[PDB]
Enzyme design. Structure first.
Site, PDB file in Angstrom:
ATOM      1  CB  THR A   1      -0.703   0.060   1.352  1.00 55.73           C
ATOM      2  OG1 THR A   1      -0.627  -1.305   1.892  1.00 55.73           O
ATOM      3  CG2 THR A   1      -2.154   0.608   1.141  1.00 55.73           C
ATOM      4  CB  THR A  19      -2.999  -1.085  -1.737  1.00 55.74           C
ATOM      5  OG1 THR A  19      -2.101  -2.198  -1.198  1.00 55.74           O
ATOM      6  CG2 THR A  19      -4.150  -1.648  -1.697  1.00 55.74           C
ATOM      7  CB  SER A  73      -7.414  -1.201   7.499  1.00 58.60           C
ATOM      8  OG  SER A  73      -7.804  -2.254   8.054  1.00 58.60           O
ATOM      9  N   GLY A  93      -0.104   0.166   5.892  1.00 63.22           N
ATOM     10  CA  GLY A  93       0.099  -0.596   6.755  1.00 63.22           C
ATOM     11  C   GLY A  93      -0.852  -1.442   7.334  1.00 63.22           C
TER      12      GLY A  93
END
Lengths: 188, 342
Positions: A1, A19, A73, A93
């Site tokens: 990402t 990503t 996320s 992350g």
């Protein structure tokens, strides 16, 4: 990402996280086309209670279905002050994105760090499972670790988290000043 | 920090891509123009992460005060099924969801770049993509970090003829720091997009290449999948923190929701009083995190398909409930956490 942030003179701000998921995605490319395929399917829950690449778990809500978009996320974020652009922020992350981004924002808002300070400051992470408090090398001195261990945290030092590219905008008498930070970490 | 007092800033994890975005600003483009140029540049210069084979999100604040979110997240293919990564006995097939063609969702990045450009940009895609094309055709120098990440991916690349052709030198040798990395086929694809827009990726020759290579290799993405790929302009999730407005990504990301939730919990304490890195402050944040991630595991998914209680998770009253369970000097072990707290 990877995350990138843009802000212009007219007051537009754009905060993009995108990503192919893992480093180099699925590692398979499209023959004749020259590009790597994502492995985003691993962001679904592939079996209830099974932890994915980021230790994230799921059940029905994040189950695979045709055409469904796997849960992310990613947290490209804009913070406004008095309706003007104040911060443009995000990070890669996986599961650590949410906590990275919030710490940068809290460092500016709660602690009055400038954006460079906010981004460089050591980061911690709690994601419920595993039940551990993840920290960075040199990021927490003995006194703090000892107090947190006493409360019942299991502290673990792991590789640095994130790669924040952030802009802070501040009003000046005429126009604005734009301040930027890249992240001395480069996770990906 | 980096500073600008005229045209703004365009910041990424690769200096060539940042420089490209910054030039767009210098040359009179807006923030969306620069972001499109960056998205294609990073697909060339940062292939570990930048891409046209993946997807993502954009959160946009417009000059006029409007706040919008662009979902260009990948979709499960039409042939995708609930247990597609499990064996006969209902057990996970090791690496099936991670390595190779079946691990892929239908790519959204190209549609996403074109969508934001068409709706809010001011420069032609043809122009914004030229710098990426130049870097693919002419090459760029492998960095120190890239040499490391490519080295680490070696055994994964080695499984696929296509990737061995693109990501190694002759004989399947790792690129080393300083080597010139040229990507001719990638430039072909970008050039299709330059000429034809997103249909240059989702239809015609590139769609054919994708479909046939999928079939050869046990993947399931078809021309029908590609032609059906849709971005979605969505409302961002919005919250406040101590007088600041927080604008972040809504489902199908969990990020913005839990960001706002965790900050909501933290808002109940005066963190400024003890300052950065105080164990009492770290404990409040970590306990909020703990509850948020438990919540994530049960409530979060693509809201087009499941009910996601975003409004309840970002409700300040819910956050206050969480905050009130936090003990001065002990944790709630994760085994005792109840998603939603009932």
């Amino acid at each position: 990402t990877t995350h990138y942030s843009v802000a212009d003179r007219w007051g537009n701000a754009v905060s993009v996280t995108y990503t192919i998921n893992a480093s180099y995605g699925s590692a398979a490319s499209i023959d004749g086309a020259g590009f790597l395929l994502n492995n985003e399917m691993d962001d679904f829950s592939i079996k209830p209670g099974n932890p994915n690449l980021y230790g994230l778990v799921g059940g029905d809500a994040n189950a695979i279905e045709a055409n469904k978009r796997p849960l992310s996320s990613m947290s490209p974020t804009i913070v406004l002050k008095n309706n003007k652009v104040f911060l443009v922020v995000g990070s890669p992350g996986g599961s650590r994105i949410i906590t990275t981004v919030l710490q940068v924002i809290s460092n500016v808002i709660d602690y009055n760090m400038n954006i460079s300070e906010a981004v460089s400051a050591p980061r911690f992470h709690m994601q419920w499972l595993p039940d551990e408090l993840r920290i960075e090398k040199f990021g927490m001195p003995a006194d703090v670790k000892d107090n947190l261990t006493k409360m019942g945290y299991q502290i673990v030092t792991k590789p640095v988290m994130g790669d924040v590219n952030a802009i802070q905008v501040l009003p000046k008498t005429k126009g604005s000043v734009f301040y930027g930070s890249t992240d001395p970490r480069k996770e990906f | 920090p980096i500073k600008n007092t005229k045209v703004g800033l365009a910041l990424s994890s690769h200096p060539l891509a940042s420089e490209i975005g910054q030039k767009v600003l210098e040359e009179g483009g807006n923030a969306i123009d620069a972001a499109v140029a960056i998205g294609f540049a990073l697909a060339v210069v940062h292939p570990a992460a930048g891409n046209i084979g993946g997807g993502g999100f954009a959160v946009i604040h417009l000059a006029n005060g409007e706040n919008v979110a662009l979902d260009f997240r990948e979709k499960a293919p039409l042939k995708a099924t609930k247990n597609m990564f499990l064996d006969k006995q209902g057990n996970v097939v090791p690496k099936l969801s991670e390595d190779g063609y079946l691990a892929a969702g239908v790519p959204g990045t190209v549609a996403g770049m074109e969508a934001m450009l068409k709706k809010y940009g001011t420069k032609k895609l043809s122009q914004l993509i030229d710098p990426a094309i130049k870097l693919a055709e002419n090459g760029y120098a492998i960095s120190q970090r890239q040499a490391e990440t490519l080295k680490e991916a070696r055994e994964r690349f080695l499984k696929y003829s296509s990737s061995k052709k693109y990501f190694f030198k002759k004989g399947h040798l790792d690129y080393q720091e300083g080597d010139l990395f040229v990507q001719k086929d990638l430039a072909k694809t970008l050039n299709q997009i330059k000429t034809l827009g997103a249909k240059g990726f989702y239809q015609g020759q590139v769609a054919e290449l994708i479909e046939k290579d999928m079939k050869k290799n046990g993947g399931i993405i078809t021309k029908e999948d590609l032609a059906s790929y849709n971005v979605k302009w969505r409302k961002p999730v919005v919250g406040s923190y101590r007088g600041y407005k927080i604008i972040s990504m809504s489902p199908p990301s969990s990020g913005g929701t839990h960001l706002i939730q965790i900050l909501n919990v933290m808002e109940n304490a005066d963190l400024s009083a003890l300052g950065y890195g105080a164990s009492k402050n770290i404990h409040i944040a970590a306990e909020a995190m703990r509850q948020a991630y438990a919540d994530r595991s049960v409530y979060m998914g693509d809201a087009d398909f499941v009910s996601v209680p975003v409004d309840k998770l970002i409700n300040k009253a819910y956050a206050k409930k969480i905050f009130d369970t936090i003990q001065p000097d002990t944790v709630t072990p994760s085994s005792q956490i109840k998603p939603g707290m009932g």
